[PDB]
């Protein structure tokens, strides 16, 4: 009971669905990238700060 417009609308909806997943997945990836960024940085900054600290 659907016209070309109605089936096309539902296709457009499905595509919007895909775009929504695309965004959520990308955000999840960038968030973990940010976590690894901060973890490694804190480790490094404290390690070398302390090494030069102990020398002095």
């Amino acid at each position: 009971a659907l016209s070309d417009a109605d089936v096309q609308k539902q296709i457009k909806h499905m595509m919007a669905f895909i775009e929504q997943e695309a965004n959520e997945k990308a955000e999840e990836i960038d968030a973990k990238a940010e976590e690894e960024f901060n973890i490694e940085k804190g480790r490094l900054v404290q390690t070398q700060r302390l090494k030069i600290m102990e020398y002095y």
Partner: protein
């Protein structure tokens, strides 16, 4: 407007696997969508539904195992409902395990129960064993004793003991008297000897005898303990039974739900898995009516799933050779099946079943034109219908009963028409139906016509009633004048009529079947199939076979007894027609100029043949080469078709002589069975006659059922069905289709 099959679309639908799960659930219970396999080259391992099916199969087997044990125990579990809810959560796996635990528990209990049972019996023996009564089977103790003496005779006393009122044998399972001979030996060689002997002999002589009180106390102790273990056994068995009843209800309902689960996963395997998104696309063939219902169903399904995925179904403009879908109901289903038994019709073919509903009962009624048996036949069908609710809601392992039950509405109708035709034939167990309308002849005038005291000579003669004496005449108001039912020459008057009737009806039925072919030719837009097919074919049939029918009625209405001597014979004129034999004199013609008509019609019948014989492939070659087809092969096909049609019409006419042949054969059985069975049971002696009729009639009714109601009714069923399949359907009902197998919630029980 003719009934035709429903459309099945080529549409594909695409949506998420979760939405697909829900939708499959919804569509399977809906039952209106037929799925196509999207991956013919992929096995169950390859579909990746194998884990779900395996789980289903395992839990299925476990449930069946338990169910079998439950059935063995004769439990009442009604299995009343809740089945229609059909949910399929993934938690079913856990449900399965809980039910798995029951199986394990039940098996463990039975195993333990048997073990405890064995221990009980051994302790039961001990009870008897404690003076001391040993336990033997004592089947052949005379020989046990002798063997004991053979190894050493006469050395030690054999003590006998007996068991009063022994109980069920631990092995045999019955109660027999038991007695035992127990010997104490000092030597080791004899202990070993008799050990081997007792092992060979049917005996339990395992423990050592003890006189000391200490052993008696030990035996008392164990005799109490075993009683306590038996009480435990009894308790665990009662618990098991309580568990089994609750499980029986839960399992029967879940079991069906599980079967549906499996059905769903099976369907889900029959799909193609997308790469872009974890979505499946599936194709179904469905008519628009169903497609609208499905779209609504899809909204319902997706709504049950938490994701409410739109689930787009895209109509396919391209059309793929579909299965044939015929909507039937409680009455017409049986008729469709006897059609399908011959074959599945071509898509958009004219469905013969709407015409079979009447045509087939009619052909039977002609073959089974027996008023009395027609009633009995209906009563049989009514019996089945009256139990319709009891037969449906029961088990029916007897397939022959199921088949006749499924055909119960066919049988009823067959009887209905058989009564109609029997009434016109005026035969009810060879009995005529007197409506006070028998005025064929005026006997008072017979004697006036120079027949004075003819009943004196009559003692050695019959004398046939003359036609047109000036005092006889007038038809019977309805059907055949009853007077022929008692005539010695019914076998010419009535046999001839039925002969002519069968020919007339057969030809008409064929012409009907051909007429239907025109509608089929229109539906598929094949003008050529009528330009060189229908038209020259129907011309052939009309000119030869319709002409004959007209002549038959003409003879009946044109000539009276006044020309009975050398009266024209339609058989001879028909033969002379075909052969163009036109004698100048010696044979009376039906009408002046008949010879000219006879020649005309046969020539025309020949003139139509070229069209049907070769012009179809000829014009196809003409049109083909102009547009641009194995011309030789097409000539072979059409030539064979032409021969089959032309020769078949002649042969088919003979086929419908079954109407006469079987109607006559039945009439012969009825007349003879009456005359040689019940008639002889009558006698001028009052009491002897009455009592004789009792016993003779009872046998007579038995023979009528055994021979006519069953066997002949079955024969006429088959022969009328033959006419439908071969002679009728072959005029229009051609080609084949595929079985229409939609998703449906079949596993209700």
């Amino acid at each position: 407007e003719l009934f035709r099959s429903e459309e099945m679309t080529l549409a594909q639908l695409f949506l998420q696997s979760e939405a697909a799960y829900c939708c499959v659930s919804e569509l399977e219970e809906l039952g209106k969508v037929q799925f196509r396999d999207l991956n013919p080259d992929v096995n169950v391992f390859q579909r990746k539904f194998v884990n779900e099916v395996r789980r289903c199969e395992e839990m299925d087997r476990k449930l069946r195992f338990v169910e079998k044990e439950i059935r063995k125990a004769n439990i009442p579990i009604m299995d009343t409902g809740e089945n229609p809810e059909v949910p399929f959560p993934r938690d079913m796996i856990d449900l399965e395990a809980n039910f798995e635990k029951i199986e394990n528990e039940l098996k463990e209990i039975n195993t333990n129960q048997e073990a405890l049972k064995r221990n009980f019996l051994e302790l039961t023996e001990l009870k008897f064993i404690l003076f001391v009564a040993g336990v033997i089977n004592r089947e052949r103790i005379p020989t046990f004793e002798r063997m004991l003496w053979r190894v050493c005779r006469g050395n030690v006393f054999l003590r006998q003991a007996e068991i009063e009122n022994p109980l069920e044998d631990p092995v045999t399972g019955d109660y027999v008297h038991k007695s035992v001979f127990i010997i104490f030996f000092q030597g080791d060689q004899l202990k070993n000897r008799v050990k081997k002997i007792c092992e060979g002999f049917r005996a339990s002589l395992y423990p050592c005898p003890e006189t000391p009180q200490e052993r008696k106390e030990m035996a008392s102790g164990v005799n109490t303990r075993i009683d306590d273990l038996q009480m435990v056994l009894n308790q665990t068995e009662d618990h098991r039974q309580r568990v089994l009843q609750a499980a029986a209800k839960n399992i029967r309902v879940w079991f069906i739900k599980v079967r549906k689960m499996k059905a769903i996963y099976h369907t889900l395997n029959l799909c193609n898995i997308d790469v872009t998104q974890k979505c499946l696309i599936a194709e179904v063939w469905c008519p628009v009516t169903d497609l609208d219902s499905i779209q609504f169903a899809l909204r319902r399904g997706t709504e049950h799933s938490g994701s409410t995925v739109p689930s787009i179904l895209n109509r396919m403009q391209t059309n793929q050779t579909p299965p044939t879908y015929n909507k039937t109901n409680k009455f017409t289903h049986g008729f469709q099946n006897i059609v399908d038994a011959y074959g599945i019709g071509t898509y958009r073919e004219i469905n013969p079943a709407p015409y079979t509903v009447i045509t087939f009962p009619f052909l039977f009624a002609v073959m089974f034109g027996d008023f009395g048996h027609g009633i009995l036949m209906t009563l049989f069908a009514v019996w089945m219908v009256l139990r319709e609710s009891r037969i449906l809601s029961q088990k029916n392992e007897n397939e022959m009963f199921s088949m006749v039950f499924s055909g119960r509405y066919i049988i009823l109708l067959m009887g209905l028409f058989s009564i109609y035709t029997g009434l016109i034939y005026n035969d009810c167990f060879s009995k005529s139906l007197n409506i006070f309308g028998s005025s064929w002849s005026v006997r008072p005038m017979f004697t006036i016509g120079n027949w004075t005291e003819e009943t004196l000579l009559g003692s050695s003669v019959l004398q046939l009633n003359p036609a047109i004496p000036g005092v006889f005449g007038g038809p019977y108001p309805f059907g055949i004048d009853p007077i022929w039912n008692i005539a010695t020459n019914k076998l010419t008057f009535l046999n001839s009529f039925k002969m002519k009737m069968s020919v007339i009806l057969g030809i008409i039925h064929m012409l009907f079947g051909v007429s239907l072919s025109l509608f089929n030719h229109i539906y598929f837009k094949k003008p050529l199939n009528i330009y060189f097919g229908f038209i020259p074919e129907i011309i052939f049939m009309s000119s030869l076979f319709g002409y004959l029918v007209i002549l038959i009625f003409y003879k009946w209405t044109a000539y009276d007894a006044h020309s009975s001597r050398n009266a024209p014979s339609l058989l001879i004129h028909f033969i002379n027609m075909f052969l163009f034999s036109y004698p100048e004199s010696g044979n009376a013609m039906l009408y002046s100029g008949q010879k000219g008509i006879q020649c005309f019609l046969i020539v025309v019948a020949m003139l139509c043949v070229p069209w049907m014989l070769l012009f179809k492939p000829l014009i196809l070659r003409h049109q083909y080469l102009r547009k641009k087809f194995d011309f030789g092969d097409t000539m072979v096909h059409q030539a064979i078709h032409t021969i089959e049609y032309c020769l078949g019409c002649i042969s088919n006419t003979a086929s419908y002589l079954r109407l006469w042949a079987l109607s006559l054969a039945h009439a012969q059985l009825s007349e003879v069975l009456w005359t040689m069975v019940i008639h002889i049971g009558l006698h001028v002696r009052s009491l002897a006659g009455g009592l004789g009729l009792f016993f003779i009639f009872a046998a007579f009714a038995t023979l009528t059922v055994a021979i006519l109601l069953i066997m002949e009714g079955l024969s006429a069923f088959l022969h009328a069905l033959r006419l439908h399949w071969v002679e009728f359907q072959n005029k229009f009902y051609t080609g084949t289709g595929f079985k229409f197998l939609p998703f449906s919630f079949e596993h209700i029980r």
